[PDB]
C-alpha cells in the first residue's frame, strides 16, 4: 500500500523505472479491514478502461508518472460488465451505460438501455434508495445531464434510458408515463427520489410540464421549488449553500445539457498521426469559470453530506471521458480523465482523514481508444500528441466506420480504499459491487 | 482470495451473476505472506491483455464463467510496460516483445528489439542467470521458437532480437558475433547459459554451424550433444527423461519454427461480422499428436526441476496468443489462451501442494483485439463467433492497414499466488517484477 507509485528515478538506469520502494506485504495487510464503512464514495469514470487511464497518465504525468488520485487506491482487481439480451436472456458482451449502471446500483444484470429494471421490466431498488431508507445522506454528482444513464440509474426505474421527461416517456415508456399510472419520467422520478445532494447538467428537461398528478401543468423546475428544493446554477451560488437534507435538498443544474469539457483539441482523423502534426491540448475557451469543476462539486457534496451523523453514500461521475471517446477526441477524453483524478484526490483526502470511508474508482465499461506506435498506419482515426515526457504518443480509434466510436467488452480495473475494499480484489462482476456496498454500509 | 469465481446462478436474476460468495477480507489476509519463496513459476501470455483474457473466457467458458487457472490467482494489479527510445532515452509508449521481456528479467528498461542489454547496449544479468549462480534449478519453456524474444531474454544479451544464429548475428549483431569476440548469437548464448530445462520450438537454427570457437564447423545441434545436453523432439521422448541438471541438461526441440496452434478458424475480414456467418473454432487437424502441449511441457518441467533441493525458477510462455493476434485470427488466439490456462492450472496445483511457490501470470504488453457489438460496422478486420453461451461475440482488429495487427500500450493485468504475491497489487512497473522475484528468492 503505497501513496507514491511514480518511477523511482532515471528510467534508463537499473531500477530507475520501479514504482515500488519496498515490500508491500505488511502495508497491504494493514489496509485490509472488515469493520463497517460509515460512508461510501463511488467514483465512475464513464468509459474509462485501463487503456484510457494509461493514455491520460502518459500524456499528463508522463509514462513513469502517477495519478495522485486515480492510481493511489491500494486494492485492485478486474471486473466484468456484460449485459443481457432482453429477448433470450443470454449475455450481450458489450454493455451500454444504462445496463451497467443498473448492475452496480441494483445488483441485477439487465438489457442495454434499461434503467433500474431487470429483463422482465420489473423494478428493483437502487443502493441510493436503500441508503436513504436507512437514514443515510445521499448524493449524486455528474458532469453529464442528470437524466443521462449513469446518474439516472440511482433514482429512476424506466424501460428505456431515452425517457428523460414527460413528453419522451409518454412515447417511449408508456408504461412508466405518469398519465398512464406509471412512476414517471426520469426527471420526475429524480424529483421523487429526493437525494440530499444532486448536481450536474440537464436543466433543459426541467422546462417540460407534468401531464398528470399533483404538479400537473407546472414545469418540472417549478415542481422542484414547490417541493422544497434549493436550486443553484453556478459556482458562486453552490458555494453559498450551507446545508442540504430531507427538508432542504440541493439541486444544481449547471448546463442545459452536458457540462463543457475542460480541454480542447482537434478530432482524430484518418492517417492523422502521419499527415497531421502532433497536438498539445489547451484549455476549452467555451467553458466558463462560473461552471463548477467535478472536484468542486465533489468537495461541496462531501461537506454537506458529511453533516449527517448516520453516514452518507455519494456517487460521482466523470461523464465525458466516454463522450469524447465516442467523438474520437483525445484532448477532450484525456482532460476529462484528469478532471476525474482531481475529484478522486478530494475523495481520498477525506477518506484518509475520516477513516471509515470506502472509496471505489472504476468504470461502467471499456471503450475504443488504443495507444499505438508513432508510425502506425491504421484504418481508423488517429492523432499524435506531445506528452509530458516530451515524446509523441499516438492514439487510435478503429472500431467504427460511423461517426461514433464504440464501447468494448474487455474486463477493466476496479480499485478501492477503506473498509471492505478487499472485495474488489481478483476477478469480480459489476453486480458484486452492489453487494459489496450494501454489506459495507450494513444496508442489508 | 477465492478459488471459484464463476457466476453464482441465474444471471438474469438478482445476485445471480455474482462471482463472490462472501466477504474476502479474511481470505485475502491469509493469502498475504512475506515468507521466502523457494520456487518461482512465471507464466507469460504473450500479448495477453485484459481484452484477450475476456474474449477467450467469453468464448470458452461463457461470460459468467471463469478460467480455473488464469482467473484463480487472488492478488491482482495492473502494470506498465512502456519501452524507451534508443536515441532520446525518452519513453516509447508501445513496447515490443524483446524490450518488455528484458525489463522483467533484468530490471532495466530498454529499446524495442533489445535482449538483455540497456539502451547503451551494455548487458545486465537476467533472473535466470542469477538463479543458476545461487544454485537453483532453472527452466525456460515456450511454444515459440527458443530464439524468439520472450524465452531468449532469459539467456541472451544481444543488440537485436533478430540475431538468432551465427549467420544473422554476423550481419546484425557484429559486436556479439563469436568470430568478432562477442558472446555469440541467441542460440549459442542459450547453449552457453545451460539452463536445466529448455523446451520449445526453433529447431531450424540448430541446423546452423558455428563460425568460430571450439565447435566451429559443427551444427548447433551437434554442439548441444557434444556439450552433454539430452535432446528430445516429441512427447514420448520427453516423457522418458528422468532427470535434468547441470551435467544432464534437457533441451527439447518440438518444431522447426514455432509449435503448431491448438485451434483452427478463419482469419477476420473486412465486415466479416456482417458478411460472413458466426464461426465455431475446431481443433487443428494438422497438429501432430506427438507434439506436447504447453501444460505437458510445464508439468514435465516442474517434475524434473523440483528434484533440486535449493529450489527452482521456471518461465513458461504461451507464445502464440500474440502471434495469432497479429494475424487477426480469433480462433488461433483464443485457443492459445485456453492452452495457457491449462499450464497455469498445473502451476497452481503444484504451488498449493508445495506451499512455498510464487506463481505469477501476466503478459508482456497489450494487443489489438477488441470485443465489439454484433452489428458493428468497423474499418478493420472483424469476425463473429459462437460462444459457449450460445450467443454471438464479435472481435475486432482495427489498428493496422498492414498485414499485421499491432501491440497497444495499455497497462494490463498481473496476478499472483504464493509468498510475496502482494508485490503485484496496485499500480507497478514491469521492471518491479524483476525485483519482486529477486527478493522473493533472496537472490539479492
Ligand atoms: Mg455516464
Ligand atoms: Mg513471445
Ligand atoms: Zn458508459
Ligand atoms: Zn458511451
Ligand atoms: Zn510480445
Ligand atoms: Zn507481437
For B381, the 3-state DSSP assignment is strand
Q: Supply B8's cell numbers.
A: 453464482
Beta carbons of B45 and B318 less than 8 angstroms apart:
yes
For residue A413, the CA-to-ligand 5 centroid distance in Å is 22
Residue of B nearest to A110 (CA): B12
Which residues have a Cβ under 8 Å from the Cβ of B442 and sit 6 or more positions away? B36
For B416, the 3-state DSSP assignment is strand
- Residue B129 is assigned to a ligand binding site: no
Please give the Cα distance from A162 to A141 (Å, whole number). Answer: 20
φ/ψ of residue A329, rounded to 5: -120, 95
Closest-CA distance, B361 to chain A, in angstroms, reads 13
Q: Which domains does chain A have, with CATH numbers?
A: 1-444 (3.40.720.10)
Sign of CA dihedral A45, A48, A52, A53: positive
Q: Supply B47's cell numbers.
A: 500479448
Which H or E element spans position B101? helix B97-106
For residue A322, the CA-to-ligand 1 centroid distance in Å is 7
Q: Is B27 exposed, middle or buried (0-12, 13-18, 19+ CB in 10 A)?
A: middle
For residue A41, the CA-to-ligand 1 centroid distance in Å is 16
Q: Supply A198's cell numbers.
A: 444532486
Q: Supply A369's cell numbers.
A: 481508444
Please give the Cα distance from A53 to A338 (Å, whole number). Answer: 9
Residue of A nearest to B54 (CA): A410
Please give the Cα distance from B90 to A7 (Å, whole number). Answer: 13
- Residue B148 is assigned to a ligand binding site: yes
Q: Is A180 exposed, middle or buried (0-12, 13-18, 19+ CB in 10 A)?
A: middle
CA B262 to chain centre: 16
Nearest to B71 by CA among B141, B20, B32: B20
Please give the Cα distance from B235 to B109 (Å, whole number). Answer: 37
Instruction: Decide if A109 and B17 are in contact by the 8 Å CB cutoff.
Output: yes
Beta carbons of A132 and A309 less than 8 angstroms apart:
no
Nearest to A199 by CA among A249, A161, A149, A131: A249
Please give the Cα distance from B380 to A399 (Å, whole number). Answer: 7
Q: Supply B235's cell numbers.
A: 512427447
Beta carbons of A328 and A397 less than 8 angstroms apart:
yes
For A228, the 3-state DSSP assignment is coil
Beta carbons of A82 and B63 less than 8 angstroms apart:
yes
Which residues in A lie closer than 8 A to residue B380 (C-beta atoms)?
378-380, 398-399
Residue of A nearest to B25 (CA): A422
For residue A327, the CA-to-ligand 1 centroid distance in Å is 14
Elucidated via? X-ray
Outline where DSSP puts E strands in A225-347: 230-232, 250-253, 263-264, 269-270, 282-283, 312-318
Mark the residues whose beta carbon lies below 5 A from ion ligand 3: A 46, 97, 322, 364
Which residues have a Cβ under 8 Å from the Cβ of A414 and sit 6 or more positions away? A76, A77, A78, A79, A360, A361, A362, A424, A428, A433
Please give the Cα distance from B333 to B56 (Å, whole number). Answer: 8
Instruction: Decide if B399 and A400 are in contact by the 8 Å CB cutoff.
Output: no
Which residues of A are catalytic, by number?
A: 97
Closest-CA distance, A140 to chain B, in angstroms, reads 23
Beta carbons of A425 and A432 less than 8 angstroms apart:
no
Report the Cα–Cα distance between both ends of chain B, in Å, rounded: 29
Beta carbons of B301 and B405 less than 8 angstroms apart:
no
Closest-CA distance, B59 to chain A, in angstroms, reads 10
Q: Is A240 exposed, middle or buried (0-12, 13-18, 19+ CB in 10 A)?
A: exposed
Instruction: Decide if A32 and B29 are in contact by the 8 Å CB cutoff.
Output: yes
Find cell 449547471 and name the residue. Answer: A254
For residue B45, the CA-to-ligand 5 centroid distance in Å is 8
Beta carbons of A140 and B47 less than 8 angstroms apart:
no
Instruction: Decide if B410 and A370 are in contact by the 8 Å CB cutoff.
Output: yes
Find cell 562477442 and name the residue. Answer: B182
Q: Is B269 exposed, middle or buried (0-12, 13-18, 19+ CB in 10 A)?
A: middle
- CA dihedral (A120, A124, A126, A131) in degrees, to 10, reads -170
Of the candidates B31, B51, B97, B142, the residue annotated as catalytic is B97
Beta carbons of A424 and A414 less than 8 angstroms apart:
yes
Resolution limit, Å: 2.0
Find cell 554442439 and name the residue. Answer: B223
Please give the Cα distance from A211 to A12 (Å, whole number). Answer: 67
Closest-CA distance, A222 to chain B, in angstroms, reads 37
Partner residue opposite B15 with nearest CB, options A19, A107, A379? A107
Q: Supply A219's cell numbers.
A: 414545469
DSSP B84: E
Please give the Cα distance from A198 to B29 (Å, whole number). Answer: 38
Compute the count of residue pairs across chains A and B with CB atoms less than 8 Å apart. 346
**Residue A69 φ/ψ region, left for φ over 0, alpha for ψ in the -120 to 50 degree band, beta for the rest:** alpha
CA A428 to chain centre: 19
Nearest to A432 by CA among A136, A106, A132: A106
Nearest to B244 by CA among B201, B292, B302: B302
Amino acid at each position: 500500500v503505497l501513496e507514491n507509485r511514480a518511477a523511482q528515478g532515471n528510467i534508463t538506469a537499473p531500477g530507475g523505472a520501479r514504482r515500488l520502494t519496498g515490500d508491500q506485504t505488511a502495508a497491504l495487510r494493514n489496509s485490509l479491514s472488515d469493520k463497517p464503512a460509515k460512508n461510501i464514495i463511488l467514483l465512475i469514470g464513464d468509459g474509462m478502461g485501463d487503456s484510457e487511464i494509461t493514455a491520460a497518465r502518459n500524456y499528463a504525468e508522463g509514462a513513469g508518472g502517477f495519478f495522485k488520485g486515480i492510481d493511489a487506491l491500494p486494492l485492485t482487481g478486474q471486473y466484468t460488465h456484460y449485459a443481457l439480451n432482453k429477448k433470450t436472456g443470454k449475455p450481450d458482451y458489450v454493455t451500454d451505460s444504462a445496463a451497467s449502471a443498473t448492475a452496480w446500483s441494483t445488483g441485477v444484470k439487465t438489457y442495454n438501455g434499461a434503467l433500474g429494471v431487470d429483463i422482465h421490466e420489473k423494478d428493483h431498488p437502487t443502493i441510493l434508495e436503500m441508503a436513504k431508507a436507512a437514514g443515510l445522506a445521499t448524493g449524486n454528482v455528474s458532469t453529464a445531464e442528470l437524466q443521462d444513464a449513469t446518474p439516472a440509474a440511482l433514482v429512476a426505474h424506466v424501460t428505456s434510458r431515452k425517457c428523460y421527461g414527460p413528453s419522451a416517456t409518454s412515447q417511449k415508456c408508456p408504461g412508466n408515463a405518469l398519465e398512464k399510472g406509471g412512476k414517471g419520467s426520469i426527471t420526475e422520478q429524480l424529483l421523487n427520489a429526493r437525494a440530499d445532494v444532486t448536481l450536474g447538467g440537464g436543466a433543459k428537461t426541467f422546462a417540460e410540464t407534468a401531464t398528470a398528478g399533483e404538479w400537473q401543468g407546472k414545469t418540472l423546475r417549478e415542481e422542484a421549488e414547490a417541493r422544497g428544493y434549493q436550486l443553484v446554477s453556478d459556482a458562486a451560488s453552490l458555494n453559498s449553500v450551507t446545508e442540504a437534507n430531507q427538508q432542504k435538498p440541493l439541486l444544481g443544474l449547471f448546463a442545459d445539457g452536458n457540462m463543457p469539457v475542460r480541454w480542447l483539441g482537434p478530432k482524430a482523423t484518418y492517417h492523422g498521426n502521419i499527415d497531421k502534426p502532433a497536438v498539445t491540448c489547451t484549455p476549452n475557451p467555451q467553458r466558463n469559470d462560473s461552471v463548477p469543476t467535478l472536484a468542486q462539486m465533489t468537495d461541496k457534496a462531501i461537506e454537506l453530506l458529511s453533516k449527517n451523523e448516520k453516514g452518507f453514500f455519494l456517487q460521482v461521475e466523470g461523464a465525458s471521458i466516454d463522450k469524447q471517446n465516442h467523438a474520437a477526441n483525445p484532448c477532450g477524453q484525456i482532460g476529462e480523465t484528469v478532471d476525474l483524478d482531481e475529484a478522486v484526490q478530494r475523495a481520498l483526502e477525506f477518506a484518509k482523514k475520516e477513516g471509515n470511508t470506502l472509496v471505489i474508482v472504476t468504470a461502467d465499461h471499456a471503450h475504443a481508444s488504443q495507444i499505438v506506435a508513432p508510425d502506425t498506419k491504421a484504418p481508423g482515426l488517429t492523432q499524435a500528441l506531445n506528452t509530458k515526457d516530451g515524446a509523441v504518443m499516438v492514439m487510435s480509434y478503429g472500431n467504427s466506420e460511423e461517426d461514433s466510436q464504440e464501447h468494448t467488452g474487455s474486463q477493466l480495473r476496479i480499485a478501492a480504499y477503506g473498509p471492505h475494499a478487499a472485495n474488489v480484489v481478483g476477478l469480480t462482476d459489476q453486480t458484486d459491487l452492489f453487494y459489496t456496498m450494501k454489506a459495507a454500509l450494513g444496508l442489508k
